[PDB]
């Protein structure tokens, strides 16, 4: 086509989706990770994670307002990944890398798994 | 913070939101523009448009599944702008520029209004 493109559009959309999440506006699911709860938008979760894409395209699970993650999932690791989904920013640290990588593998977030593997290999 | 950032993340999220729209997955509103209907995600509309941001933060309108636009709004102009919202790509042409600009003004999409004004000024 003969379209023009606005370079910052995708980033501005994601910034606004994050602002809606922070104000709990039109959030439609709560992700339970042991004792912790995280409110989010199903569409953003699906757009970032192979696991959520599978869950919310399921004819029964698409209608659930609560999703309980595997008890082995670390809430801080999930929080870091949820923040990444809404911002493109990953708070990767020596103290959280193992939890972040394990959570990204479970959530099926290949690019996060890739950078975690690379950061781990560099420290050995 | 000491975060790392994935450059393509925002673009990949928007590409997936557009794929969900094309397959009518978790779309939660229909925008009626005279004889035409457009299914979309309220969160994406709010993230791109000052008008939809106002509509869906309203305590009554946030719950509506159908929104009827002003009868002066051109469906093709709306279609072009809805595509822009989900892709960052604007199909701006001599034959549609006036409708696109009028629709962007109504939808409160300042960056689109700006490029339309610039393209019009160049042709006079």
């Amino acid at each position: 086509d003969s379209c023009i493109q606005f370079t910052r559009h995708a980033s501005d959309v994601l910034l606004n989706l994050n602002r809606l999440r922070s104000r709990d506006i039109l959030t439609d699911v709560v992700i339970v990770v042991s004792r912790e709860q995280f409110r989010a938008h199903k569409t953003v979760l699906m757009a970032c994670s192979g696991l959520f894409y599978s869950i919310f395209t399921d004819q029964l699970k698409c209608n659930l307002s609560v999703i309980n993650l595997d008890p082995e999932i670390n809430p801080e690791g999930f929080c870091i990944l949820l923040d990444f989904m809404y911002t493109s920013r990953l708070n990767l640290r020596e103290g959280n890398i193992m939890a972040v990588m394990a959570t990204a593998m479970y959530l099926q977030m290949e690019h996060v798994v890739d950078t975690c593997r690379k950061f781990i290999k560099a420290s050995e | 913070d000491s975060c790392i950032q994935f450059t393509r993340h925002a673009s990949d999220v928007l590409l997936n939101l557009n794929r969900l729209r094309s397959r009518d997955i978790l779309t939660d509103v229909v925008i009626v523009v005279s004889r035409e209907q457009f299914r979309a995600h309220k969160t994406v509309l709010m993230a791109c448009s000052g008008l939809f941001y106002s509509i869906f933060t309203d305590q009554l309108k946030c719950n509506l599944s159908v929104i009827n636009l002003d009868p002066e709004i051109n469906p093709e102009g709306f279609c072009i702008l809805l595509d822009f919202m989900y892709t960052s790509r604007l199909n701006l042409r001599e034959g549609n520029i006036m409708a696109v600009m009028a629709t962007a003004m109504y939808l409160q999409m300042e960056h689109v209004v700006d490029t339309c004004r610039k393209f019009i000024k160049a042709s006079e």
Partner: peptide
Amino acid sequence: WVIP
């Protein structure tokens, strides 16, 4: 705005 750019030509993509």
